[PDB]
Structure formats: structure tokens, C-alpha cells
Amino acid sequence: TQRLNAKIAVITGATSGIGLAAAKRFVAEGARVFITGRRDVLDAAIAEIGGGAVGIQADSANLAELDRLYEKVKAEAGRIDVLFVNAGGGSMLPLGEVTEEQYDDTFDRNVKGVLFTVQKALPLLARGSSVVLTGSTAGSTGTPAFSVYAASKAALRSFARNWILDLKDRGIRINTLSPGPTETGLLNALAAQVPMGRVGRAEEVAAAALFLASDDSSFVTGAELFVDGGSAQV
Amino acid sequence: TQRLNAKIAVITGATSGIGLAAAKRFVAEGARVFITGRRKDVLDAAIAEIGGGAVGIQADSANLAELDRLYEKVKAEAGRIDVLFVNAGGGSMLPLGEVTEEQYDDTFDRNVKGVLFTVQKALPLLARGSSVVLTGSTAGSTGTPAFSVYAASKAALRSFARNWILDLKDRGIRINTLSPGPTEAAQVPMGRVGRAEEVAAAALFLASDDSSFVTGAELFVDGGSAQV
Amino acid sequence: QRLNAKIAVITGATSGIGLAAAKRFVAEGARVFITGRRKDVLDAAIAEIGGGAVGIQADSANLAELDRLYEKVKAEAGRIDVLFVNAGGGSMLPLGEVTEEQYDDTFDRNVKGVLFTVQKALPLLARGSSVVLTGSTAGSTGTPAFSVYAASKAALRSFARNWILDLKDRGIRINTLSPGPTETDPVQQQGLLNALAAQVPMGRVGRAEEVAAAALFLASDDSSFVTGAELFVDGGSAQV
Amino acid sequence: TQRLNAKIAVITGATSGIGLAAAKRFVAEGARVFITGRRKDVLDAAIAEIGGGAVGIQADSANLAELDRLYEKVKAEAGRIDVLFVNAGGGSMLPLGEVTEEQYDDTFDRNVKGVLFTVQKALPLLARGSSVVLTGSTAGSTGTPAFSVYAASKAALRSFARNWILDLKDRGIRINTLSPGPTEGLLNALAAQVPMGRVGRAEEVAAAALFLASDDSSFVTGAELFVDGGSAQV
């Protein structure tokens, strides 16, 4: 199966979890893969992925390093066909205990960083390209002590609705991929909420990312695809 | 690729449009396919066009007794169902003030009642790791002039996916709604209507193991139509 | 006196939310017409409501009885300012056990009956009138053994999105009011209400009066720029 | 006649438009009203226009220290808050490709960060049986060209209502989002999209705010009430 044959894929935050599972899958599907990470752990990830995957150290939030990331991609690949944006950002604090630090860190990574990651990619984004933004079931549900994270992910999903109108006739699709909790006591409690009776696997999220990245989803844009075992559907 | 290798697929309403495109794609992906259609001539033409050993049964998907005959045939010839694609559709346009009992009855009998019993009667055959795909519509979550009966039927349709996944706890049966927008323009963010093969490709995603943690969901294939 | 000199027609108002709405609407100055299927129950409801409220025997699963309802309203009031379509209900069966009767009887009341209740009201609905449809949190959530009822309430909500386009320039607003769990065999009932309350962010089920108060908002001029909407009165239950 | 009799209401951003209309309605309904504005002259003019013993405090929500001063004055003068209508906010229009850090920061600092801290800092004063109303927007759940920053901020805003009601379990505080659509060349363009065929009046939004503030909405929490003439409903 070579469902991403001759496609250039850039994946931010692909050093672990969903990003890493996606990098592995995209390489397996024939993509020329560029991944980013902040820290070494990137070199290990690149070895684990293999298949000619290249790593670029970049702080996805930091603006000047994004310029350097896209300069490298332009020089080495000349275009982007798949952009998969995974942002870290997130911790738990209830209202009454929320700090400026938590707000700033979460939104800088999950919202601001994402906006500029995509904006700076625009000149490289080819006709028939696909931008996949990692959301969360948190963005449309209620969870105790999770309001800052949840709000950041609500903001994230909104981007897909709106940017598809700014990029009219450019042939760039933009979609949100929204996982429930995955494997990567608490897990037993979370699994009880899920209709399917278990938490997701990073690889299952990666398979859904593949759908959105691939030409199979050619008439899917502005959407939010939940990969949640039913958790946010009931 | 062979994403539905050794799978048994049943597709209701597969003699034209999206249903037909899905049957073609499912066969291409290695599925053993059973299809239904109301009319013999279009069904024979469809079976010929699909190829790949596809089998056709002339059945009205909304008629409960004919559903019994479909599933008797599937049981005898295949023994199980791994993929059920319920592609019931149809409706017409009447504004409030002009809605007839006929329009209501025909639309709901086919789009809601027929679907419920199609799935209910399939249950004994649905294997562990099976996937049920229900054809919804962008109409089910939007407003359109003179479309209220159809829109309401498709809203009911989508609800089924949220609820049946709870009735079938631990059975390993996923249920998802596939909701196309306009298919083969100015309102669509992508600036065009969708192609049948594009809806079929999304159907394949939901039918396949790639969607193994997707259930109760509504996947829009609408060029952004119902997303803005 | 927020419904002073308004004619309100409420279907299914002999108990629970409908009754609570009838009482509130009368308190707010409305001339209230209610429907119910059982004459003795209907009469007792009218006695409870008071304030000149009038009862008419009718089932929405019956289009002929709707015709008679509106003949009566036309003759006695000549118009409708507020139409609260609350008549409906359902039962529990899981997939595998759903009967034709459960499907038909639920949809005949909750969907078909609602459409014709509103359609047959159209000639009487004044400029500036408000139609309130009783939905449910069930219409947008998943609940075991509830698929027929849930689908009926999803259909119901869709009507508000669509009819507001059909009724372009008619000055008729259409909104869905969607209650969560409300306190509307006795040992089992108490145990289930406790489990329902545990789900609710507010930690209790709603009172019928609270749903009636939200119905009043939608019926009143305060909601003059609210149409096509679904107002949840659920203590947060379908919001999380 | 008096649906907010002897209630303390604090409205941020109430010197024009919806906020001002809400201040007038709340006063007419018997509330003791405190309003907030950024410009002292405008604030004083608003107070004179409102009457009914309404009191004004100069405050910017992009400034956490000025929120502290606001609640210091409310505590000193009223000792509690029963209704908190967080209406302060704004935005501007830029398409993806042209979004600036300033547009992002300035929008989120008021519409998201400022809202979070406005509510958090009110918590000690919020009485049992109190109501918090957050001004959202139809933009928060729709797509609009050149509007992605504002839209995302209002998606985040609505998320707060889903989540904070869990943080504040048993506190007797309701939190709801009030989401206006078009409200009074460009107006006629907006009006033709509205099912009701016109933009909303500020007084109509204020009436819906009153519902959420009042005891009539006692079993409404975590919700989003659209006051949009059908705009985002179709």
C-alpha cells in the first residue's frame, strides 16, 4: 500500500505519540517525510521512523524558527502536500487556580503557534494539498480542571471552518482530527466513559490522519473527524 | 490496495450514484459484495458493471418481509456480514403549508423506518469488528427552503449512530453516519459538487479497519458546505 | 404580565412541563387553550390551571382532531400568538427488540403530529407569533434503549432550522426547547432519578416550572431575535 | 415588573452597543449595576445615559491589575455579585496569509485571556444562585472570510461555559454563552443572510442577556443561546 506515494509530508510534534505514529504510517505509505521537535529525541525518532525521513529542530510556537523550517523544506523538497500540525500545550488547573503561565503556555503552543505554522507554510502548499490539525474531544466537551486546554482546542477546530474561506480556489483542504484519550487507574476510568470500552491507540489516530492526508478525503474540508471510540458522540 | 480483503459487504440501494460507486470500490478492495435494488433491469446492469463476483438481490429496503429474504440469502451464501452500507435516500421538495401525508410517509418510511429495520435484521449476521455505514445528508444539520421533511428524516438518521452503539455495547459493531453535501455549487467552499467516487472513498474509510476507533460519528463529505 | 392579551395554544398540557407552562402562561396574562387525550385528566388540568383556560380533547396522531382543535380556536379567539407543541412521548426498546408499533406510534406523535400541528396552525398564526417545539437532550445524545425516541427528537429539532426558511417574511418564530431530566415501581423511580441527577452538572433534575420559564422566554417578546434555535434547559447535562 | 430586584450586576464593556443596552435593561429590572469601560469620558457619558444609580469603573481586561481594582470597588460597595455579564471584547478582519501577531495577541488578550481572569477574579464575590453570561458570537461556530482570529477567540469563549460549570460544582453559579449574530451598505449584506431578514437591535440582545441573568433560566447552564435571527441555525 502506497497511499501517499510521491507526497511531501511535514509533521510538527512528531517525536512521540500521535505525531510519531503518523510519521511511521506516512513513511510506510510512501511519503517523503519531514518532522519537527524541540529537542536529540528528534534524532532517535528519525532512526525509529527511517525510510529517508528527515528531522528539523524547530520550536513550532517560535516564529523565527518556522521561517528556517520552511526554508529547509523549500530547498530540499520544493513543496508541501501534507501538513500535519500536532501541538503539545496542556495541563490541569481548575478555575480559581488558573495561572497566566498555564494560559500563555497552552495558547502559545496550541493556537498561536498553529496559526503561524500554517500561515508560513502557505507559499509551499501545493494544489491538492491537505492540512490536518490535531484537535481533541476536549474542544467540544466539559472536563474538570481542563478549561484552558479545552478552550485552546475549541479555537483550533474553528481554524478549519474559517481558513478554507481565506484560501478559496487554492486547492488546499483544512481539517481537524480530534482524538479522545489514548494509551500514550486513570486509563481504566477514562475507558469506562467510552462506548467502545477502551482508550484509543496512537496508531488509530494516525490511520485517521492518513485518511485526511490522502486523496481519499478529496471532498472533505473544514471538518472535524472524531477518533474517540464514541466518547464525544454520545 | 486490498483494504476489505476477505470481508463480506452488503450495500442497500447500490444500483446508481453513491451506492453503485461504493460497490465498485468495495469489490476493488477485495470485498465479497451483495447489493440490493428495487428494479430488476437497473440491478442487472449494475451487477454487470460492478463485476468481481458481486451478487444482486431485488428488494425494497423499506419492506420488512423483503429484508428477511435478503438476509436469508446472505446467511446461506456468506454466513456473516462485515460491512453494511445502508444507502437509503430520496425525498422531494414541499414548503410548510403544502406538506402532504404522502410526502411525510414516503420519506420517513424509506429514510428512517426502512433503515432501522435494515440494520435490526442484519444484527444476527454482523460479525465482531464489523462496520455499519448509514447515508445521512448535510440537510440533517442545516436549513434549506422546502426541504423540512427530508432534512428531518436525515437528522433522525444521524441520531441512530449515537444511540445504537450503546445498544450494541461489547458486540464489536461500529456504526457511523456518512453525510454527503451536494454531489454530481457557489455555496460550497471548494466551489464544486462532490463526485460519487469521493463519497465512496469516505465510505471505504468507515468500512475499513483504518477507522477502528471511529464510531457514533458523522463524517461530512461536503466540500465544506455544512462546516461554515 | 409578559403575555398580556396573547392567545396561547399548548398541546399536551395535562401534566408535567405542558401543565407547568399552561399555569405560567395564565399567570403572565395569556388566554390559554390546552389539549389532552383523556377527558377526565384534561378537566382536572383545567381546574388546576384556572384563569379562564379552555381545554379541547385532541390527539396529534390524528389529523382530523387537529382540524377540530383549530376550528375551535378560530371561533373562540380568532388567532394564535403562542403555539407550544409539547404533545409527545416515547418508550424504551434496544435495537434488536424495536417493533413497528414503537416506531410508528412514537413518530406519529413526535414528528408527524408536530409537523401537522404547526402546518394546520399557520392560517391563525399572527405576525409576531412564536412557535415552541418540545425537543429533548435525547435528540443530540446517546442513551441505551432509546433510539426511536432519540431519533424522533432529532427530527423535531431539524424542523426549527427549516421552517424558518419556509416562513420567510411571515413574522413567525420557531424554536426548539430541549429539556434534560425533569421530575415529571415507586422505589425504582427514585433510584433512577438519583442516577439521572448524578449525571447533571447542577447535581439535580429540573423542575417542570423551570422548563416552563424557559418556554415563556421563547413565547415572549424578549426572544424577538431568537429563531431556528435550540435552547437546552438541562442543568448542563448535554452541554458537557 | 422587576426581574432583577436587589441583584448586583457587573457588566464589562457596557459603554456602547449590546453592553449599554443590557445596562439600561438591567437597571429597568431593578438591579444595582456596575459597568466597566476603557475610556473615562465615554464611561461617564454612559453612566449618565443609564441612570438608576448605575456606577462606572474604568478597566481594561487586557490588564489583570485593573480587574483587581474593579473587584476591590465592587466588594467595598456591594459586597457580592449576582449577575456577571462579560461583554468586553472586540476584533478585526485579516485573512490567513496576512494575520499579524498583534491581531492575534490583541484579540485573545481581551476575548479569551481577559474573560478567563474576569470570571476567575469574580469568584470570591459570586453569590450562590448567581449567573455568569459570556458574550460569544455566531462567528464561534461558523466560517467567515478574513475572520479566523476573532472566530477562534469566540469558539474558545463558548468552551469556557462547558468546562467551568464542572470546576464550580455545588457553588450555585451558572455560566452560559450568549451568542449574537448581526446587530446594528455592509448592514444590508449581512441582513440578507439572516432568515428574519434584518439585523438585530441591541435591545433584543439585551433581552436575551436578561433571560440568562434572571431566575427564569435557573436550570440553564453550560449552554449557548444564539440571538441571531436564525443566522447560524441554518
- Top CATH class of C1-240 equals alpha beta
What are the start-end ranges of the H helices in chain A? 17-28, 41-49, 63-76, 100-107, 113-121, 147-166, 186-193, 202-213
- Residue A21: alpha-carbon gap to chain centroid: 11
Length of chain B: 228
What is the DSSP annotation of chain C?
-TTTT-EEEEES-SSHHHHHHHHHHHHTT-EEEEEES-HHHHHHHHHHH-TT-EEEE--TT-HHHHHHHHHHHHHHTS-EEEEEE---------TTS--HHHHHHHHIIIIIHHHHHHHHHTTTEEEEEEEEEE--GGGGS--TT-HHHHHHHHHHHHHHHHHHHHTTTS-EEEEEEEE-SB---HHHHHHHHHHHHHHSTTSSPBPHHHHHHHHHHHHSGGGTT--S-EEEESTTTTT-
Are B18 and B87 contacting, i.e. CB atoms less than 8 angstroms apart? yes
Residue of chain B whose alpha carbon sits nearest to that of D138: B228
D27: left (phi over 0), alpha (psi -120 to 50) or beta: alpha
The partner residues of D36 in beta bridges, in order of sequence, read: D57
Give the minimum alpha-carbon distance from A138 to chain D in angstroms, rounded to a whole number: 9
**Residues of chain D with C-beta less than 8 angstroms from the C-beta of C239:** 161-162, 165, 221-223
Q: Is A57 exposed, middle or buried (0-12, 13-18, 19+ CB in 10 A)?
A: middle
Residues of B with active-site annotation? 150
User: Closest-CA residue in chain D for A165?
Assistant: D145
Say if the Cβ atoms of D218 and C210 lie within 8 Å: yes
Contacts of B99 in chain C (CB under 8 A): 115-116, 119
Chain D residues inside the 8 Å CB shell of B189: 143
Contact C240, D166 (CB under 8 A): yes
Question: Which of C95, C237, C240 to probe the A interface (max A CBs under 10 A)?
Answer: C240
Size of interface A-D (CB pairs under 8 A): 128
- Residue in A with minimal Cα distance to B183: A219
Residue D198's SS3 state is coil
* Half-sphere CA count of D183, side-chain side, radius 13 A: 23
- CB atoms near residue A91 (< 10 Å): 13
Q: Locate the domains of chain A by residue range.
A: 1-234
Judge: B97–C164 Cβ closer than 8 Å, yes or no.
no
D12: nearest Cα among D86, D117, D78, D67: D86
Nearest-neighbour CA in chain A from D156: distance (Å): 4
Catalytic status, residue D104: no
List the grid coordinates of D117: 481572569
The DSSP bridge partners found for residue B58 are B37
Question: Tell me, what amino acid is at B170?
Answer: D
Separation between Cα atoms, residue D196 and residue D180, nearest integer Å: 14
Interchain proximity B119–C95, CB inside 8 Å: yes
CB contact set of B81 (below 8 Å; sequence gap of 6+): B8, B9, B10, B74, B122, B125, B126, B127, B130
DSSP tag of A61 = S
Q: Using the CB atoms, write b or e for C159-168: b if 16+ within 10 Å.
A: bbbbbbbbbe
Q: Report the length, in residues, of chain C.
A: 240
Size of interface B-C (CB pairs under 8 A): 126
Q: Which residue from C minimizes the CA distance to A144?
A: C240
Which class would CATH give B1-228?
A: alpha beta
Distances (CA, A) of B80 to B71, B85, B126, B161, D181: 9, 14, 6, 21, 51
Hey, which bits of chain D come out as E strands?
8-12, 32-37, 55-58, 81-86, 126-135, 173-180, 224-227
Query: What resolution in Å is listed for this PDB structure?
Result: 1.8
| Residues D16-38 as b or e (16 or more Cβ within 10 Å = b) | ebbbbbbbbbbbbbbbbbbbbbb
Interface membership of D2 toward B (CB under 8 Å)? no
List chains touching D (3+ CB pairs under 8 A).
Answer: A, B, C
Q: Any idea which residues of C carry the catalytic annotation?
A: 149
Q: Is C96 an 8 Å CB contact of chain B?
A: yes
How far is it, in rounded angstroms, from Cα D111 to Cα D115? 6
Contact present, D223 and D162 (Cβ < 8 Å): no
Distance between CA atoms of residues B166 and C94, nearest Å: 9
| C232 interfaces chain D, CB cutoff of 8 Å | yes
The residues, ordered by sequence, that sit 6+ positions from A182 with a Cβ below 8 Å of its Cβ are A17, A18, A199, A200, A201, A202, A204, A205
Residue type (1 letter), A197: G
- Cβ contacts below 8 Å, chain A against chain C, sum to 12
Q: Are D177 and D134 in contact (CB under 8 A)?
A: yes
| C-alpha separations of B67 from B96, B127, D101 in Å | 33, 18, 60
Helix (H, G, I), strand (E, B) or coil at D189: helix
**Separation CA B195–CA C229 (nearest Å):** 32
The string over C1-39, giving b where at least 16 C-beta atoms fall within 10 Å of a residue's C-beta and e elsewhere, is ebbeebbbbbbbbbebbbbbbbbbbbbbebbbbbbbbee
Q: How far is A159 from chain C (nearest CA, A)?
A: 22
Cβ separation C222–D211 shorter than 8 A? yes
> What's chain B's Rg over C-alpha atoms?
17
Give the three-state DSSP class for B207.
helix
Cα–Cα distance for residue pair A78/A70, rounded to 1 Å: 9
Q: Is A1-234 a domain of CATH 3.40.50.720? A: yes
Q: Which of A142, A195, A230 faces C240 most closely, judged by CB atoms?
A: A142
Is D230 in Cβ contact with B142 (below 8 Å)?
no
Asked whether the beta carbons of residue D234 and residue B142 sit closer than 8 angstroms, the reply is: yes
C161, C168, C235 member nearest D221 (Cβ)? C235
Q: How do D8-12 and A172-179 pair as beta strands?
A: unpaired
- Which of D34, D150, D160, D164 is labelled catalytic? D150
Q: C92 vs chain B: nearest CA distance in angstroms?
A: 11
Q: How far is A58 from chain C (nearest CA, A)?
A: 36
C189 contact D CB<8A: no
D170, D219, D220, D225: best to mutate for the C interface, most C CBs within 10 A:
D219
Instruction: Please check whether residue A140 touches C, CB under 8 A.
Output: no
CA C193, CA C202: separation in Å to the nearest integer? Answer: 14
Listed residue (D179, D170, D173, D176) closest to D229, CA to CA: D179
Find residue C7's DSSP bridge partners. C31
What residues contact residue D188 under an 8 Å CB cut-off, 6+ apart?
none
CB atoms < 10 A from the CB of C204, how many?
15
Do B199 and B20 form a contact (C-beta atoms < 8 A)? no
Cα-Cα end-to-end distance for chain C: 35
Name residue C228's amino acid. Answer: G
Residue C207 to chain B, least CA–CA distance (Å): 26
Chain D residues closer than 8 Å to B143 by CB = 195, 230, 233-234
CB distance A217–B227 less than 8 Å? no
Which of B117, B167, B173, B177 to mutate to test binding with chain C, by most C CBs within 10 Å of its CB?
B167
Distance to chain B for A223, nearest Cα, Å: 6
Chain A residues near residue B227 by CB distance under 8 angstroms: 160-161, 164, 221-223
Residues in chain C within 8 Å Cβ distance of A233: 142
Cβ–Cβ below 8 Å for D152 and A162: yes
Measured between beta carbons, which residues in chain B are less than 8 angstroms from residue A220? Answer: 202, 219-222
User: Vertex A197, ends A193 and A199: CA angle to 5°?
Assistant: 80
Paired residues of A226 in beta bridges: A178
* Contact criterion met (CB < 8 Å) for C141 and A234: yes
Per-residue cell: B101:
401525508
At C25, which amino acid appears? F
Phi first, then psi: give them for residue D18, nearest 5 degrees: -60, -45
- What subunits make at least 3 CB pairs under 8 angstroms with B? A, C, D
**Cell of residue B179, nine digits:** 453525510
Under an 8 A CB cutoff, do A161 and B217 touch?
Answer: no
Residues comprising chain D, all counted: 234
- Strand pairing of B126-135 and D126-135? unpaired
Spatial contact of C199 and C164, defined as CB atoms under 8 Å apart: no
* Alpha-carbon dihedral sign for residues D15, D16, D21, D24: positive
CB-based burial label for A28 (10 Å; 0-12, 13-18, 19+): middle
The per-residue DSSP string of B137-192 comes to -GGGGS--TT-HHHHHHHHHHHHHHHHHHHHTTTS-EEEEEEEE-SB--TTSTTSS
Residues 194-223, chain A, touching B (beta carbon < 8 A): 195-197, 200-201, 204-205, 207-208, 210-211, 215-223
Provide the 3-class DSSP secondary structure of residue A5: coil
- In whole angstroms, give the CA distance from residue C20 to residue C18: 5
Which neighbouring-strand residues pair with D131? D83, D174
Find the closest chain A residue to D157 by CA distance.
A151
| Among candidates C140, C145, C167 on the partner chain, residue whose Cβ is nearest the Cβ of B167 | C145
Burial class (CB in 10 A: 0-12, 13-18, 19+), C195: exposed
